[PDB]
Amino acid sequence: KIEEGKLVIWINGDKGYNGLAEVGKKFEKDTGIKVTVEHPDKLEEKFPQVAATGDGPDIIFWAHDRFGGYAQSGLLAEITPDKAFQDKLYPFTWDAVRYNGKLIAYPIAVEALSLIYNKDLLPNPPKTWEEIPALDKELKAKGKSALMFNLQEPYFTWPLIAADGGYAFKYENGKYDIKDVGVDNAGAKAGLTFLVDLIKNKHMNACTDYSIAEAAFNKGETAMTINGPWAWSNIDTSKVNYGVTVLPTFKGQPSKPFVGVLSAGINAASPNKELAKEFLENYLLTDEGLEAVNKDKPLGGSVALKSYEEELAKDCRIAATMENAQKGEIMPNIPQMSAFWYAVRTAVINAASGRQTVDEALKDAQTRITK
Numbered sequence: 001k002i003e004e005g006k007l008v009i010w011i012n013g014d015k016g017y018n019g020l021a022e023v024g025k026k027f028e029k030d031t032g033i034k035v036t037v038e039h040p041d042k043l044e045e046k047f048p049q050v051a052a053t054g055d056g057p058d059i060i061f062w063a064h065d066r067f068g069g070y071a072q073s074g075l076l077a078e079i080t081p082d083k084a085f086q087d088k089l090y091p092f093t094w095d096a097v098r099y100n101g102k103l104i105a106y107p108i109a110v111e112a113l114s115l116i117y118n119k120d121l122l123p124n125p126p127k128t129w130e131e132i133p134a135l136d137k138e139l140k141a142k143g144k145s146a147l148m149f150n151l152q153e154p155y156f157t158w159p160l161i162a163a164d165g166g167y168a169f170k171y172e173n174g175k176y177d178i179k180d181v182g183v184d185n186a187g188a189k190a191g192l193t194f195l196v197d198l199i200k201n202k203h204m205n206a207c208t209d210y211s212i213a214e215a216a217f218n219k220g221e222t223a224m225t226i227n228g229p230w231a232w233s234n235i236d237t238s239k240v241n242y243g244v245t246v247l248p249t250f251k252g253q254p255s256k257p258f259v260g261v262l263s264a265g266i267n268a269a270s271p272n273k274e275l276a277k278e279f280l281e282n283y284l285l286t287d288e289g290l291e292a293v294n295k296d297k298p299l300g301g302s303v304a305l306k307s308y309e310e311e312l313a314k315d316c317r318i319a320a321t322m323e324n325a326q327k328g329e330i331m332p333n334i335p336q337m338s339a340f341w342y343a344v345r346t347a348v349i350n351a352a353s354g355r356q357t358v359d360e361a362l363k364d365a366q367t368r369i370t371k
């Protein structure tokens, strides 16, 4: 806990917390209410843990997909924007934070993975996954790799997994069927096999994680990596001429990255929910508030506020980003998403390392998720 009259906010490390802080200062300079910004590891896991006991931030930040389970655990306060306000933000982003019809978070920006490449190494990047092995053989013959991305977080290989068919939960009767899962279908099985084949054929290291991959690329070592706008910041700091473009197709099918929407939720244990309502609505969610943050680290192609969106809807990167988002699908926000992720994370890791075959991996995942 804390005490009404104050206000803490939590948000992930790859996000521009400093800019978020810069938004807090303006708030603390207008009403005295101090604004602290924290960013602890394994946030998606930590929040519910500490928020279970009744502790944590007044405002939590994270991709909408986790808000469903959080609201199922009575950890979130519903929010009540006026029909007019709802016009200030796109409806589909409101949908993203809508659980059981109710609204339990504020959408900020749409996120989606994109293909990022070294232009001095690839003036013309591969339009297909299938041409990466060769592409890596030419590059290897020069002490360089063709691609590297976080193989330890399922969110990153998922684009390839869904491309030819894989999916999380099927939507039906205006609702996600928690029993119909496409984690073990032909499509999913082929995407992952291509991943595992890349590794076994030594064009990728099953070991590669986030820190590792961000380095290989920023340091000119790898020709391509897969990531979201938030990562653009560090790549800007290095001397690397990069392009942000559409993900490579798999079997001619576009890659379908799972789309997220950065969201701000107000803890259920809210002694000052009304302070959060005015903060997020009249500060962070204004052209000035969003700008304050974006300059720190890119929020992504599209932001919830229509007014601010019109201003940056024209930028190769944003472009690439909004293109990968359409070829993809918005993540569900139901409680079972956590089970889904845990399962896919293990299946991918297991498959990549070889502890299980692709078939054993995905089947087991399919079993554990619908279990």
Ligand SMILES: OC[C@H]1O[C@H](O[C@H]2[C@H](O)[C@@H](O)[C@@H](O)O[C@@H]2CO)[C@H](O)[C@@H](O)[C@@H]1O
Pocket (backbone or CB within 6 Å): 012, 014, 044, 062, 063, 064, 065, 066, 111, 153, 154, 155, 156, 260, 341
């Ligand atoms: O790896 C599964 C993981 O995917 C997503 O997490 C993303 C997040 O959406 C982004 O904002 C950024 O932080 O990268 C994360 C990947 O490490 C889901 O939102 C998350 O629930 C899930 O566990």
